[PDB]
């Protein structure tokens, strides 16, 4: 149901116009400097999956709580299928840049023969054909026409794909550390300190943007609900427009190719 406040419904309209117009105007310019090599496809399909997920959401959320509107059982679930298929096509893309950066230090001899363009152009096809086959899937407390046996399906997939990202960046910081002993001290503390101040920022902008909201969404299935948790889920849902703005500050800015190609044109 739709009860937040009459008082806390006049600041989100100003907040979503400043955390909503930059994420459009940054994920567009990033796709205006792409150049294309088979690990720059995976960074491209999460700069197009965060320009669509920030228009359907900013149009539905400003419609449902501030100035009011009603719907039906087939009109409403169609707009809800455009924020469910665009928030798991922005997490499955974070699962492909952490499986591409894992077959480059674990088997560094084979990264120009395993990961080729015939297996990196079909790979993002088999995510957009599973994320719209589990978001049209309703063929059948806070989400109106949704039964509780379906919120134990979406959370149980988005959680196990965030436990292959906090393992695929804690094996690059162990393999580049034992290696750091030999080709520095014996070989001729230099290499594992330039990968320990960017690789800690990727894991502290992910656990504070998929950890509060994936906890409240468990408190429905895992027991009773109440009144004051319905008013704080409407501010714990604007974190998704915070983890759409910082993504081209961590993946596009932190490079030597995308920052020099920009400089020349
Ligand atoms: C109560 O809903 C809403 O009024 C809105 C504003 N939507 C949200 O508030 C919202 C906020 C978030 C973070 N999600 C989300 C994201 C992924 C998956 C799921 C689900 F449904 F599969 F569990 C939900 N939905 C929408 C109305 C019409 C389209 S959206």
Author numbering: 108 to 141, 148 to 253, 266 to 313, 335 to 411
Quote the authors verbatim.
The cannabinoid-1 and -2 receptors (CB1R and CB2R), both members of the lipid family of G protein coupled receptors (GPCRs), are the primary mediators of cannabinoid activity. Based on these expression profiles, and supported by animal studies, CB1R is thought to be the major target involved in the psychotropic and tetrad effects of cannabinoids, as well as their analgesic effects in tests of nociception, though because of the high similarity of the two receptors, and the peripheral distribution of CB2R, a role for the latter receptor often cannot be discounted without direct testing. The CB1R orthosteric site is large and lipophilic, explaining the high molecular weight and hydrophobicity of many of its ligands.
To understand the SAR of ‘1350 at atomic resolution, and to template future optimization, we determined the cryo-EM structure of the ‘1350-CB1R-Gi1 complex to a nominal resolution of 3.3 Å. Consistent with earlier structures of human CB1R in its activated state, the ligand occupies the orthosteric pocket formed by transmembrane helices (TMs) 2–3 and 5–7 and is capped by ECL 2. The experimental structure of ‘1350 superposes well on the docking-predicted pose of the R-enantiomer, which was the enantiomer with the better docking score to the receptor (-43 DOCK3.7 score versus -38 DOCK3.7 score for the S-enantiomer). In optical rotation studies, ‘1350 was shown to be the (-) enantiomer, together identifying ‘1350 as the R/(-) enantiomer. Key learnings from the SAR include the importance of bulky and hydrophobic groups in the R1 position, which is modeled to pack against W2795.43 and T1973.33, with a meta-substituted CF3 being most favorable. Further, methylation of the chiral center (R4 position, ‘1350, ‘4936, ‘5806) meaningfully improved affinity (approximately 6-fold in ‘4936, 15-fold in ‘5806, and 50-fold in ‘1350).
